[PDB]
Write a protein that binds this ligand. Structure first.
Ligand SMILES: Nc1nc2c(ncn2[C@@H]2O[C@H](COP(=O)(O)OP(=O)(O)NP(=O)(O)O)[C@@H](O)[C@H]2O)c(=O)[nH]1
Ligand SMILES: [Mg+2]
Length: 172
């Protein structure tokens, strides 16, 4: 059945690993252990009766693997651009990521922005409408997710996968 590669991209500690863990194993680890070695996961979804194998590449947020993370753009097909709603600096840094993808990844790559840590509204620094407006500016999808609270985690991955399926099916 169909195989889609997926990139989780963002600053260190936005919750990329936790987002993949909630998608893969429907669980949450309150601990923060930074990703060093880029590791992929296969998560099988069903879109309109078709099984699609999502090869999800969980990249390291640390600056010393920027050059290493970028190398994984080849054949990526889809990229989750994750920032932390409680961290404007991470949100400011997704502009840099989106720009890097436009220049270095293929034109037909599908992009979505996730406002992660959406459950923690108390420490919110980034308004939902500021993420929506940025997504609108670049003409890409956006939704607020919580890996901890399991909000829009499946929805985000099904939304992105559909946009990849739609472009792929239209080639015929
Ligand atoms: N409240 C809350 N905390 C979250 C959520 N997602 C992740 N976190 C927390 O944020 C921290 C970083 O999560 P992690 O998945 O390791 O982030 P990362 O972006 O993969 N980090 P790195 O790029 O360095 O590997 C952890 O303490 C984790 O529990 C979420 O949806 N809600
Ligand atoms: Mg990670």
């Amino acid at each position: 059945d169909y195989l889609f590669k997926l990139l989780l991209i963002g600053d260190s500690g936005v919750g990329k690993t936790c987002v993949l863990f909630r998608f893969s194993e429907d669980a949450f680890n309150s601990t923060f252990i930074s990703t060093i070695g880029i590791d992929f996961k296969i998560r099988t979804i069903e879109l309109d009766g078709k099984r699609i194998k999502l090869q999800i590449w969980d990249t390291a947020g640390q600056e010393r693997f920027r050059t290493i993370t970028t190398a994984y753009y080849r054949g990526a097909m889809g990229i989750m651009l994750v920032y932390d709603i409680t961290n404007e600096k991470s949100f400011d840094n997704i502009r840099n990521w989106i720009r890097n993808i436009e220049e270095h990844a293929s034109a037909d790559v599908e992009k979505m922005i996730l406002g992660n840590k959406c459950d923690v509204n108390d420490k919110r620094q980034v308004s939902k409408e500021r993420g929506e407006k940025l997504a609108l500016d670049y003409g890409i999808k956006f939704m607020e997710t919580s890996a901890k609270a399991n909000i829009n985690v499946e929805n985000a991955f099904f939304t992105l996968a559909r946009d990849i399926k739609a472009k792929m099916d239209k080639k015929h």
